[PDB]
Ligand SMILES: NC(=O)c1ccc[n+]([C@@H]2O[C@H](COP(=O)([O-])OP(=O)(O)OC[C@H]3O[C@@H](n4cnc5c(N)ncnc54)[C@H](OP(=O)(O)O)[C@@H]3O)[C@@H](O)[C@H]2O)c1
Ligand SMILES: NC(=O)c1ccc[n+]([C@@H]2O[C@H](COP(=O)([O-])OP(=O)(O)OC[C@H]3O[C@@H](n4cnc5c(N)ncnc54)[C@H](OP(=O)(O)O)[C@@H]3O)[C@@H](O)[C@H]2O)c1
């Protein structure tokens with residue numbers, strides 16, 4: 001409770017004037033039971049009227065109660081076509097996010113993401129939504145290398161590499177989003193996220209940082225199967241949520257934003273080291289690319305959570 | 321008239337390639353978008369030899385098209401409903417797509433949705449009815465930013481999500497991905513053929529692709545107008561040569577393969593195409609300045625050559641036959 005409360009209070013202090021340009025907007029969040037979707041719901045519910053599209057209502061209640069949210073101030077739907085009230089802003093978070101799924105089920109990866117993007121843009125256009133935010137991925141930059149990748153950079157994709165299911169589905173989605181904006185004057189923004197971290201992540205999450213946390217707790221040891229020199233950007237999930245909120249507030253027909261914390265670029269080894277020290281174990285061995293996130297800074301956004309707080313909060317949160 | 325042209329063409333095909341055409345007699349062949357330029361020519365060449373199934377949006381349109389091109393309607397079965405086809409189909413050739421530039425940019429969303437959904441549907445139909453092989457007609461627009469000559473099937477292009485004109489290539493790219501993925505997960509044999517631009521007889525006067533823009537302007541306006549400087553160079557290929565290349569690929573037994581299909585002997589600037597057409601119709605070419613970015617590109621077509629295919633028709637024959645066919649109709 002206290003971890004989340006301290007975070008809700010810090011956000012409001014730094015940016016409450018912004019969260020305010022959002023008072024009583026009707027906000028639809030798809031994939032709202034998900035990591036990012038649920039943190040957005042938490043932050044915005046009450047101060048606005050929150051509609052949550054999810055595959056399973058009960059799963060939504062359980063997640064929302066766990067992270068200390070008032071279910072009586074969210075309207076949970078399972079069927080887009082039952083939402084009858086007017087909607088001001090849509091945040092589309094719904095997607096399959098398991099890497100395994102991308103290679104095991106590349107057909108459905110494409111079909112699911114394509115179909116949902118289509119359905120939500122159709123819904124948005126028909127409903128004369130004020131703005132739709134589409135959550136995308138740094139995987140859209142594909143091959144591109146550099147320490148300063150801008151939104152106008154563009155990956156290439158082999159059609160015969162099945163792991164491209166997810167980036168190719170997000171690319172076609174992005175194209176549809178821009179298209180609805182140019183054709184119909186529907187306000188849209190795309191946000192390309194690095195990789196979210198911080199409290200409310202679960203022990204079973206298939207991400208390297210959580211593999212390290214799990215392995216330190218269960219095996220009292222973290223094993224690296226390479227030298228771990230690859231560097232990766234991370235950003236606290238609350239700082240993702242606040243960035244999306246800033247984008248929501250910008251009146252602009254079309255825009256693309258990289259969302260990352262440019263202070264966090266860490267090697268896998270260094271990540272393993274700090275996690276191990278935090279859990280009183282050791283790293284043992286058994287034998288890149290950075291986005292420019294300057295654009296988002298121009299809205300007045302800043303990230304509040306550094307890697308160390310994000311890890312402490314995430315670990316402490318799991319333990320309790 | 322028309323029929324002399326067509327008969328001569330079919331006889332040449334038989335003389336050169338009757339061997340390969342024969343590897344397919346009595347196969348059950350489903351052609352989607354069969355009323356279109358390439359689909360209908362494939363049907364023309366193949367009906368009689370083999371059992372032809374033609375999926376179209378409108379049966380009478382397909383009847384009328386097939387008779388315009390001197391086909392025998394009693395030797396093909398036309399369907400408007402995929403689900404109403406019962407017989408075990410051996411080979412599917414997927415030809416249905418929107419092809420007009422204007423539609424790509426006025427309707428980018430519908431461009432993507434139509435191509436994606438039709439690809440998905442025909443792949444599910446194929447998988448479900450244990451089809452031997454499916455051939456997917458793709459485009460040299462797949463190569464995106466790739467420039468210059470000798471472009472091989474493994475070369476990969478980049479695409480901007482903010483260029484509305486990418487509706488067609490992004491839709492083909494995601495479809496290619498789908499097609500590869502079905503061959504990798506279900507052991508369905510798939511082929512992708514990346515085509516340049518077909519020309520030749522039985523092109524219709526309302527087509528808005530550039531060759532017909534020129535011909536139709538020549539005839540109606542007594543003048544051809546370019547809207548660009550026309551320095552873009554492209555590859556062209558006679559529609560009957562496209563169809564024979566597709567037939568050679570049909571005969572391959574290969575789990576997955578991508579082929580460039582072009583005539584390496586035909587590479588021409590838009591301008592020079594305009595002037596040569598204007599020579600044939602006794603008009604002038606003019607400009608009104610004030611489309612794709614103005615690249616230049618040639619495909620490596622060695623794989624299809626390797627199967628034993630050659631193109632039979634030169635640019636003058638293709639254009640002459642195309643123009644004469646159009647004069648005879650209207
Ligand atoms: N986490 C990141 O750093 C990150 C990075 C780049 C992009 N993104 C994108 O941002 C969005 C949110 O990510 P996240 O981290 O919150 O992901 P998450 O925790 O995996 O949750 C994703 C949400 O989508 C739903 N979903 C999953 N499969 C679905 C399907 N087949 N049909 C419909 N809904 C489905 C999930 O509902 P169920 O529980 O019912 O499956 C859940 O509500 C996604 O679009 C994701 O691709 C996230
Ligand atoms: N011609 C070329 O140089 C060339 C080059 C590259 C790629 N290709 C590909 O080759 C294939 C055949 O091209 P083509 O030149 O024969 O094209 P076409 O003459 O324009 O014929 C298109 C075919 O697709 C059908 N079609 C169009 N819109 C449709 C829709 N919304 N739903 C269902 N069917 C639809 C048309 O039927 P309707 O009468 O019902 O509209 C017709 O049967 C296409 O996939 C095309 O992208 C052609």
Ligand SMILES: Nc1ccn([C@@H]2O[C@H](COP(=O)(O)OP(=O)(O)O)[C@@H](O)[C@H]2O)c(=O)n1
Pocket residue numbers: 207208223224225226227228230268
């Ligand atoms: N136990 C581990 C896990 C990851 N790694 C390194 O960390 C990188 C990122 O790990 P990951 O599991 O998130 O993703 P992949 O990029 O390996 O699919 C790996 O490519 C390895 O170089 C390691 O060295 N030892």
Ligand SMILES: Nc1ccn([C@@H]2O[C@H](COP(=O)(O)OP(=O)(O)O)[C@@H](O)[C@H]2O)c(=O)n1
Pocket residue numbers: 421528529530531533545546547548549550552590611612
């Ligand atoms: N009337 C015309 C038609 C085409 N064009 C040029 O010819 C090219 C090919 O025409 P198109 O409409 O088939 O081609 P895309 O640009 O859609 O590939 C265009 O890109 C323009 O450069 C022209 O200058 N004037």
Ligand SMILES: [Cl-]
Pocket residue numbers: 076077078079082
């Ligand atoms: Cl519902």
Ligand SMILES: [Cl-]
Pocket residue numbers: 183426427428429430431
């Ligand atoms: Cl559209």
